[PDB]
Design an enzyme around this catalytic site. Structure first.
Site, PDB file in Angstrom:
ATOM      1  CD  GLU A 135      -1.281  -2.384   1.760  1.00 46.03           C
ATOM      2  OE1 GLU A 135      -0.296  -2.365   2.535  1.00 46.03           O
ATOM      3  OE2 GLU A 135      -1.747  -3.430   1.272  1.00 46.03           O
ATOM      4  CE1 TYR A 160       4.163   1.427  11.141  1.00 50.75           C
ATOM      5  CE2 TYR A 160       2.102   1.596   9.900  1.00 50.75           C
ATOM      6  CZ  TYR A 160       3.369   1.065  10.061  1.00 50.75           C
ATOM      7  OH  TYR A 160       3.857   0.147   9.146  1.00 50.75           O
TER       8      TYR A 160
END
Ligand SMILES: CCCCC/C=C/C/C=C/CCCCCCCC(=O)O
Ligand SMILES: CCCCC/C=C/C/C=C\CCCCCCCC(=O)O
Lengths: 580, 582
Positions: A71, A190
């Site tokens: 991705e 993240y």
């Protein structure tokens, strides 16, 4: 020996040719993406002669195998710096970036069904995060913890029940493959790294994908670029050790000890011969099954982990590989499977859930669909079809993975590690809602499913302390760099293709002292606009008055704040971002 | 019909060929950088045929009295300008762009000033480098930034600042480097504060400025012209545009005809919806006059073709702006005169070296930007760029650029307003403030130098007080084939009197009219960036941490105490320490 930048000036500028590079050479250990990216930067920005660049590759089937971890998003800043320079192999007079950019505008990725349960029904609250105020405060408190305070801290150490019961955690853990015992420090990275895309967490509207599998769409274009510049690809080479001299003022790689097609050999290095090590590997020691055979479990260390251990003995600054390749819990994700079919009943069942024709050639699932009530905690995705240029036009290939490896399935009552390809397919078809009297035939005879067992697929996320990963260029290293997703650089997130390209570019730029900025990790956690959006999204689209309505000390702190900013630019900004 | 972006993905991506462009044409009206930039984007991103791109120019095809222009400083975050000039081949370095040439030069020879303000005939200001802003002055700065732009219609800078601020070194640096007058647009002042906040630590020493090797014509215009000519673009000369007939209906604005005089003949260019028209409305250089070493530049109030054209467009719709806000009622105190003083005299050159600490003839940075004479009646500043600024100029010469913010005030040595002064008289006043002996100044100016003065009636016009609506949008509502570009067009956040604004409006016009499927870089996000704002607090307060800033405010000290107790363990504390606020 580098600096970070942002903006178009440094993006579009070209570096001067580095000093004395005509007298330098480079050795790249492996042919994974970080190594190929480093070779590309050595050609383009180092202006190193291709004949002096040596890519050392160790290598010289019952069905298609797809992988994950590819991705992409718009703010892969280093990756797009690289691939604007790599010619497309699909479109004339265009780069890989051009091909990718146009494709993802013509067919933008998004999901029409992100979570299912009860054998194929959509989750009723799909789209909402269902975060309590306690859970939101835990997210913020993690981000406000200094990275230096998170050595060896688990995700379960910083979150409690509300968070783990949220839809946010379903989306998060499955889309990134976080386990509860994984690194809180990496989860924190993240959270801040991708905060600009929080409005796309639930529907995957920020994801972007290449046309084909990553070997076809990213590796082969780089290989063609490198070969057109004379880069040497050397096969059947296993690197067993690198002798490094670690003195008071320098670290210098002196010798690469190899097996070249069975012969013990030695590559002698000078300070002018650069060595780039991709330390560690998430795919090493992978095993494969087939429709009738499980992928056999293994704990073997192969060449990559053995090499990093051999380097780690030579300096504490070269990292601690055992934090990543030992003590991996047996519950961890190990198995993925690729299930290929032309069967109309299966394809129509998928269409009924994801709402799109899997054979149309466009987005299908838009990213993984998570089966929330599966014992295995299984998710699956179907990218634009077909992902292989040689595949028949009437076939799809589905990628399946299980977060939990030691739990009996709901239909096949075995742990996934004991399951053949067809058994994994059967468990999946059960959770799609296929009638149970058709499942065995559809899995065994109408489908071909290849399982893969990867001992180290969770290794990037193991709990770690600062120092466990070597710096990209360790202190005083003259000709040695570490690249890939077990090397250390500030802020960026591992298990991403961007991290491979960033470490490659930082390695080449530092070792050759290239006089051009490296793009910083995107500044979104510092951007007040992005942060206002995050507040709105995390609170499931409530403004400040609804957020504070049930707290006396908030409802009055807000009333005093609003009085001070009424009629000002701050109020207009907050209205623009839906907080007022 | 456009979207903003940032980051490398949109920077490096190329747009698809826009729809039906093979059947479209373009007319560029109004001299200057914006028209040339729009033509470049039409070629590169529009993929329009060069034979269909018509650059209409009124002029005919083309110790010396050199003339330089000031204020063409660049910075790194001219985001649109660098998007353009990475595509323009250098005329000085093989296999390199204009950006490449500029980038390498400013790395080899980074600009900064070792003396920014002088007084008392050549002495450095003792507080040079400090902002000397009071807490009240800083609050006024913050309060202006927190005012909505919509509330600043016609507001002057003197309406929003008071005595402390106008007494600050900050205002000395600010007004002179940007040429703000006290009666100018507070709206534009506010845009500048937010636009360049990332460079506050370089305000006083000009360490954020970057310059081309030569004057703008040699280093930017000629490279663009060669690029356009290599693509077959049509350069049409002796064309004066008198009006554009526009249909302004309840549903569309469509340019129908361009009424021109072409080499003395009245003509009409008929337009369809597929023929695009780009108007650079208004001009800061129109009606300029020139003097010489012995003659003042004659003052003028004449309106020329650019201001007359904008007036003729404004009477067809208020959405086309209001030129009279910018070209009428310009105060007679305003900056009008600049001068370029050229010399090979060693005494003048050595005097400059004694002040700026660099050899003016070495070819490197000299003053690093303007030096301001703080106690000059004319409020004069001057700069010496890397020398020489002209390829064919002798290597023993320098050319100094001089300007005066106040035009109706007697000088300190030449006791006349600058508008009554010859070149040599402007030179004499300048040399007086350098500290040259008054017994030497007259002959140094008359017989050892050549100084060319220029009078520009509209040089301050970009900054005149304005209301929203006074500038046309780059593409007005419902416009099918008409765009406005340059530094009198309207786009969000960016600052006029910059070359970046010319390129940005050009890019936005071409992208909107052709519907080009690629992002335009937003104005750099620095006012939204918490790291940048932390640095701004530290710098604005002359390098004080939060404890020192608040120590004399009971309310602020108490609020800080509670904040510090909350953030002590945390990433917020480490961030503040990194930016020197704790
Ligand atoms: C203050 C913190 C609030 C939480 C912010 C969280 C944002 C999460 C956003 C997710 C959308 C996906 C972005 C693209 C990721 C690509 C890399 C990968 O997929 O591997
Ligand atoms: C809100 C905090 C106050 C901000 C103060 C910031 C000032 C910026 C200082 C220097 C700017 C240098 C680069 C600008 C060059 C633009 C071109 C021009 O000059 O025309």
């Amino acid at each position: 020996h580098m600096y970070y930048s942002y903006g178009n000036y440094e993006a579009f500028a070209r570096p001067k040719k580095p000093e004395n590079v005509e007298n330098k050479s480079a050795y790249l250990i492996g042919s994974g993406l970080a190594s190929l990216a480093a070779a590309c930067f050595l050609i383009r920005d180092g202006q190193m002669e291709g004949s002096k660049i040596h890519i050392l590759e160790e290598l010289p089937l019952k069905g298609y195998v797809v992988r994950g971890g590819r991705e992409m998003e718009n703010h892969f800043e280093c990756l797009w710096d690289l691939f604007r320079s790599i010619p497309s192999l699909e479109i004339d007079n265009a780069s890989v970036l051009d091909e990718f950019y146009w494709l993802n505008k013509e067919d933008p990725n998004y999901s029409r069904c992100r979570v299912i349960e009860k054998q194929g029904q959509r989750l009723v609250t799909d789209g909402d995060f269902t975060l309590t105020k306690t859970a939101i405060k835990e997210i913020v408190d993690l981000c406000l913890t200094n990275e230096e305070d998170l050595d060896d801290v688990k995700i379960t150490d910083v979150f409690s029940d509300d968070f783990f019961n949220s839809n946010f955690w379903i989306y998060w853990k499955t889309m990134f493959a976080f386990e509860p015992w994984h690194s809180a420090m990496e989860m924190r990275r993240y959270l801040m790294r991708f905060v600009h895309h929080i409005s796309g967490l639930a529907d995957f509207s920020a994801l972007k994908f290449t046309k084909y599998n990553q070997y076809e769409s990213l590796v082969l274009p780089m290989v063609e670029y490198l070969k057109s510049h004379g880069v040497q690809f050397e096969y059947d080479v296993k690197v067993e050790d690198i002798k490094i001299d670690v003195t008071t003022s320098q670290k210098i790689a002196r010798e690469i000890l190899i097996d070249r097609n069975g012969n013990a050999e030695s590559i002698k290095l000078t300070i002018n011969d650069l060595v780039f090590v991709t330390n560690g590997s998430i795919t090493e020691s992978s095993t494969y099954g087939d429709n009738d055979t499980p992928a056999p479990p293994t704990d073997e260390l192969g060449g990559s982990w053995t090499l990093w251990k051999n380097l780690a003995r030579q300096s504490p600054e070269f990292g601690n590989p055992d934090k990543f390749c030992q003590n991996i819990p047996k519950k961890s994700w190990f198995v993925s499977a690729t299930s290929t079919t032309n069967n109309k009943e299966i394809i129509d069942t998928i269409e009924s859930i994801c709402k799109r024709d899997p054979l149309a050639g466009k987005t299908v699932t838009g990213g993984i669909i998570t089966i929330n009530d599966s014992a295995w905690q299984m998710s699956f995705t179907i990218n634009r079809q077909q992902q292989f240029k040689d595949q028949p036009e009437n076939e799809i290939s589905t990628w399946i993975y299980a977060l939990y490896s030691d739990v009996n399935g709901d239909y096949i009552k075995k742990p996934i590690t004991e399951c053949s390809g067809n058994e994994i397919c059967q468990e999946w078809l059960y959770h799609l809602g296929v009638s149970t009297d058709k499942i065995e035939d559809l899995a065994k005879h109408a489908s071909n499913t290849i399982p893969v067992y990867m001992p180290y697929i969770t290794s990037y996320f193991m709990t770690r302390a600062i120092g466990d990963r070597p710096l990209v260029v360790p202190h005083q290293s003259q000709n040695l760099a570490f690249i890939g997703n077990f090397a250390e650089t500030e802020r960026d997130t591992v298990f991403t293709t961007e991290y491979s390209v960033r470490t490659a570019m930082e390695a080449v730029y530092q070792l050759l002292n290239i006089d051009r900025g490296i793009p910083e990790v995107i500044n979104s956690p510092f951007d007040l606009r992005v942060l206002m959006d995050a507040i709105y999204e995390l609170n499931d689209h409530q403004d400040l008055r609804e957020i504070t309505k049930d707290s006396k000390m908030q409802k009055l702190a807000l009333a005093g704040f609003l009085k001070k900013i009424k009629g000002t630019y701050i109020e207009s900004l907050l209205k623009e971002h839906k907080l007022l």
